[PDB]
């Protein structure tokens, strides 16, 4: 259906018809918005090649990406389920601690920095995955590793410290 944002939508239309047997089935990701934002930088750190392969396939078949790149899409869904399972079997308390703060904080990452710095160190030492943001200014300390967040309503506590992989306490 159209990508226009609706202004007079009073109804919703569904379609109980399933994808044909010729297309392999993929169990869809069951995670909601707040968990997916807390795991995004770990999805990226593990599924970049698959994510990058899907999008390059769609740019290789203009106007036909939906129908001719289905295998890549199943591959991204599977790759991104692996991280979700991995975070669950190894970081379950910290992961919930982070995306619950995110739900109460407008999904703003700067508003939940102490929960991210705990979840990230649990992910780094268990799933060996590390949050990387490209082209951050080199002079300035990265914003996700800054002790003081200027846009945070509750000030980051002095005891809570940022997590940098490869550095001990």
Partner 1 sequence: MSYSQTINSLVEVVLVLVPSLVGIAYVTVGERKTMGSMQRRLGPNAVGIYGLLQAFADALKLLLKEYVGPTQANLVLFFLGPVITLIFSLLGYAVIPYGPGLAVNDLSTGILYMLAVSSLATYGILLAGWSANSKYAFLGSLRSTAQLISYELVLSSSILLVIMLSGSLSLTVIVESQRAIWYILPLLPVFIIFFIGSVAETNRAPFDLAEAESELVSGFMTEHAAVIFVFFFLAEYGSIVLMCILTSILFLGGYLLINAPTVEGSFYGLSLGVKTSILIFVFIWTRASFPRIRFDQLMSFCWTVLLPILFALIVLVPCILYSFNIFPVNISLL
Partner 2 sequence: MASGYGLNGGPSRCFPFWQELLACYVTNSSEDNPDGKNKCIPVMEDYYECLHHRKEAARVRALQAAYREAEAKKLQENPPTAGQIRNLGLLNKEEDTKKVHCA
Partner 3 sequence: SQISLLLLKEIYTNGSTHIMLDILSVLAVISGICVIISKNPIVSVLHLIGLFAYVSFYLILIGLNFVGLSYLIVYIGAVSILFLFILMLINIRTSELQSNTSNSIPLTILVGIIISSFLFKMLPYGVIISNKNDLFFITSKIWDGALAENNHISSIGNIMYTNYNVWLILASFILLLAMVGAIVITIKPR
Q: What are the residues binding partner 1 (CB under 8 A)?
A: 106, 150-151
> Whose structure tokens read 């001719």?
68
In the complex, least distance from residue 152 CB atom to partner 1, rounded to whole angstroms: 8
Per-position b or e across 75-112, b if 16+ CB within 10 A of its CB: bbbebbbebbebbeeebeebbbbbbebbbebeeebbbb
106 binds, options partner 3, partner 2, partner 1, none, Cβ within 5 to 8 A by partner type: partner 1
Residue 54: how many CB atoms within 10 A of its CB? 22
Q: By C-beta, is 11 or 148 nearer to partner 2?
A: 11
Both tokens assigned to 74? 């199943």
Q: By C-beta, is 14 or 150 nearer to partner 2?
A: 14
62 binds, options partner 2, partner 3, partner 1, none, Cβ within 5 to 8 A by partner type: partner 2
> Whose structure tokens read 């990387």?
132
Residues contacting 146, CB < 8 A, separation 6+: 162
**Distance separating alpha carbons of residues 87 and 96, to the nearest angstrom:** 10
> Where do contacts with partner 2 occur on this chain (CB under 8 A)?
2-5, 14, 16, 62-63
Residues 13 to 72: which contact partner 3 by CB under 8 A?
13-17, 55
**Candidates 3-11, 115-123, 132-140, 159-167 — which segment interacts with partner 3 by CB under 8 A?**
3-11
Q: By C-beta, is 10 or 140 nearer to partner 3?
A: 10
140 binds, options partner 2, partner 3, partner 1, none, Cβ within 5 to 8 A by partner type: none
**Burial status of residue 142 (CB atoms within 10 A of its CB: 0-12, 13-18, 19 or more):** middle
Q: What is the contact surface with partner 3 in residues (CB under 8 A)?
A: 1-17, 55
């Amino acid at each position: 259906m159209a990508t226009r944002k609706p202004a007079f939508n009073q109804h919703v239309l569904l379609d109980t018809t399933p994808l044909p047997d010729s297309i392999p089935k993929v169990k869809e990701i069951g995670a909601s918005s707040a968990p997916l934002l807390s795991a995004s930088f770990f999805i990226g750190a593990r599924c970049k090649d698959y994510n990058d392969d899907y999008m390059q396939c769609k740019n290789e078949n203009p106007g036909r990406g939906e129908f001719e790149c289905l295998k890549e899409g199943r591959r991204v869904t599977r790759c991104a389920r692996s991280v979700l399972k991995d975070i669950n079997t190894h970081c379950l308390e910290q992961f919930r601690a982070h995306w619950q703060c995110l739900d109460n904080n407008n999904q703003q990452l700067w508003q939940c920095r102490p929960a991210e710095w705990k979840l990230n160190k649990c992910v780094y030492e268990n799933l060996k995955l590390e949050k990387v943001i490209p082209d951050q200014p080199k002079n300035s300390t990265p914003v996700h590793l800054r002790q003081r967040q200027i846009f945070a309503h509750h000030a980051i506590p002095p005891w809570e410290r940022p997590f940098i992989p490869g550095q001990p306490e």
